[PDB]
Amino acid sequence: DSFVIRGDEVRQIAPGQTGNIADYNYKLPDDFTGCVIAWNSNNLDSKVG
Amino acid sequence: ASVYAWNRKRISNCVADYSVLYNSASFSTFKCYGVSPTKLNDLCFTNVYA
Amino acid sequence: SALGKLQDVVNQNAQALNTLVKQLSSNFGAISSVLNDILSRLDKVEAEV
Structure with missing residues (x-):
């Protein structure tokens, strides 16, 4: 699930x-x-404006 | 207040709503003891000290 | 005083049931001796402990 x-x-992604x-x-x-696997994605998902 | 000189208010004779507290992400920690935060809205108390 | 053997059998069985009833008031290391406190104060993950 992605x-x-x-x-x-x-933190809310736990039982x-x-x-x-x-x-x-x-x-x-x-x-x-x-x-439960997560990574910071500011370099992939953030945009100007 | 300063931590050595902590300031206490007695809360009494009023209806609370703790969901206003525990739903807010503003609180850098929210730790409860002897109660679950989501269960606070079902209870009553003699007084509260803040 | 002569029927002490039979009264002893009545008394021992009362001490046994009175001890068994009074043990419901014990915490055993839980938050309360009353099961409705635990269930009205805690959500399942903490209540079940």
Whole structure:
């Protein structure tokens, strides 16, 4: 499962998390088996304006 | 206040809403003990000290 | 005083059930002896501990 979010919100990508990213964008199972992998992409995704 | 001289307000006789607090990303930490933050809105208390 | 053997059997079985009931008031290292406190104060990840 693949997406972009701001650095602050990366904490919401874990089991039992809450807030508008977890609850209204991407919700994990409480008992999820898996890996969560993230990297800063300011050099790939930010733009002037 | 300064940390050696911490300032306490008794909160009483009012209805709270802790969702206004725990939903906000403004807080560089939000750690709770003996309660879950998302569970605060179901409870009542004798007083709160801030 | 002569029926002490039979009254002893009544008394031992009361001490056993009274000890078993009073052990519901113990914390055993939990946040409360009352199970509805835990379930009304904590969300599942912390409540189940």
